[PDB]
Amino acid sequence: PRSLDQRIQTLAYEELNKAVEYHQAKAGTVVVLDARTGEILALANTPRNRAVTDMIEPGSAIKPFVIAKALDAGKTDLNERLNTQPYKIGPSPVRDDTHVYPSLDVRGIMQKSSNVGTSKLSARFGAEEMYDFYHELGIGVRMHSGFPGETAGLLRNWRRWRPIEQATMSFGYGLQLSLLQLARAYTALTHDGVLLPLSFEKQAVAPQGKRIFKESTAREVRNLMVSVTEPGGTGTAGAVDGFDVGAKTGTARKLVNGRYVDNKHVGTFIGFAPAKNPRVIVAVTIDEPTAHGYYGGVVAGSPFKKIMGGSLNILGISPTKPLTAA
Template sequence: MIGFTNIDGQGIEGIEKSFNAQLTGKPGSRLVRKDKFGHVIENITEVNPVPAHELQLSIDERLQTVTEDALDNAVIWNKAESGAAVLINIPTGEILSMASYPDFNPNNREGAQLDDFRNRAISDTFEPGSTVKPLVIMTALQQGIVQPDSVIDTHPFTLDGHRIRDVGYYPELTLTGILQKSSDTGVSHLSLAMPVQKLMDTYKSFGFGVPTGLGLTGESSGLLPKRRYWSDLDRATFAFGYGLMVTPLQLAHVYATIGSFGIYRPLSITKVDPPVIGTRVMPEELVHEVEHMMESVALPGGGGTKAAVRDYRIAVKTGTAKKIGDDGKYVDKYVAYTAGVAPASNPRFALVVVINNPQNGAYYGGAVSAPVFSQIMGDVLRLENVEPDGMPADSDHLLVMHGSHVAVPGS
């Protein structure tokens, strides 16, 4: 992330390159007249030097260390191809830590491969899988398609010759249950009940499809599809994270916006004072409702129990996405995600952990990236002396299944 300079002191990678002009300054110059003995007898013109600016990064050395250590160990343990993690200060938009593995030592680059120099947190793009499901539920609530206590028919069904089903069998689920069980059928029904542009607008407003504006060279803008025609299958899979590409940084930005209950703030790699007010992109009450539902994911019965942090409430979503091969077809390789905010009662930190192509048996986000999330977020909360907020208060909205009327939106 920091990068390095060449022998002339010019930044050629990372922050050193992105902020080279501020870090370098400009030398001064003077035009003089001398006598035959070489003595200066007249100053004709003089340009004062411009000193280099000090750059105070938002990166916290302690939090960067725990993030790097946990990510490195996870990639190695899971025999994965690579990994990335991003931690954001929600109230300010400051990046507190950003890790990428494989990496290199900028003070000793001997033996480093060219690929090691890439900051995967900003450059690598993947389909985000189930991590987008909270946005689908928010959009459905905003459009009045469902209410917070609605129950959805989640039986398997067929679209365009393809079977839409869940990992487990759940005939019906509440909205909380759709998140806790990560129901593809549930979000598919919600997506099919709304114009696809409504979901697209939510994805855009939360930060997908555009660069974050962080200012680092090599950042990808990801990809949102531009289709004239959307099949029902396209609309369904779009709701569980296929058909779009995002970077780990973009995903962290989305979750920081969830953690601020719908306020979209610009991100910064330098210290921010005072904090930017930001722009509201979703009603506060609605986002708060869904954020509370997300707490069920790390509770018993959820797909992200390994992301739980002792003594703290966390709102989290795991995800697993198949990778696309060189021929444009899906292959048996996976990306494991865990994204969330904490403490859930008053979110201060948003964290995303991405493990690319784990090959040690497990590959689901709840098994591979969730423990890394737990380790990093737990260390962050304790290092920052954040007061524990315990278990979530009892709420009907954390019900997963009950026997009331079952509805299929739009039916």
């Protein structure tokens, strides 16, 4: 891509390699976007172009979009406190294993990455509505980069779902997209509600977007996502000194031939900073770590944090909150 900033590209490879080494992973990928122009600033892969070719399950990285849709449609607000106790959809249990609370507001649902809370907000929409929404985010929609072997992704026809499936998709499983498509989705949050096409070319202003959320909604959701990286959140491993950082983790069991394997995992970390006025989106996947854990926060949190901090410095953006270190 001619859009690449070689300084960020260099930083991307170095940090990726360090995480891949430490976790003794099979492979890894980094995408860095300009959060307002959609320019592709870094696109880094261990020795094929996985960022473009490899569809992955987004996991918890999809959850802010469910929350954003619920808020945007007025189906919830910042005052509602939802029951977060376990429940069942037919025989299938849905429960929160991340936290101790029997209820959470939407901020808490975000912070704790609540399955119970997110699935309930998704459930306030019909299956077909949610299918259209995922498609609208670009899921199943080719990017037409021109890169060989590019994936469209996977989005199952809504007529084929079960009620368990809709909830499962609200957790980010059963649907799939490339890391580049996921980073694209995040532009709807960073660019004040407007989904960007992305640009492989230098471009100071994106000329054409597609609104998905109100500005107010996107701003609100960005503010909520800061809870993810602050103490009490599930993404503290991605915290960046001096900045409010909006982020999510992803952890998926790897798919081999239709089905899941219990002992292979893909870990993902994605986010943006500064949260109020985003400069870049940074996305990292670590494929099949075999050392020091496998959770997205555990394997991808550190390289995200270093690529983000390093990128904000390179790009001349200064801290918005007191630094606690150098």
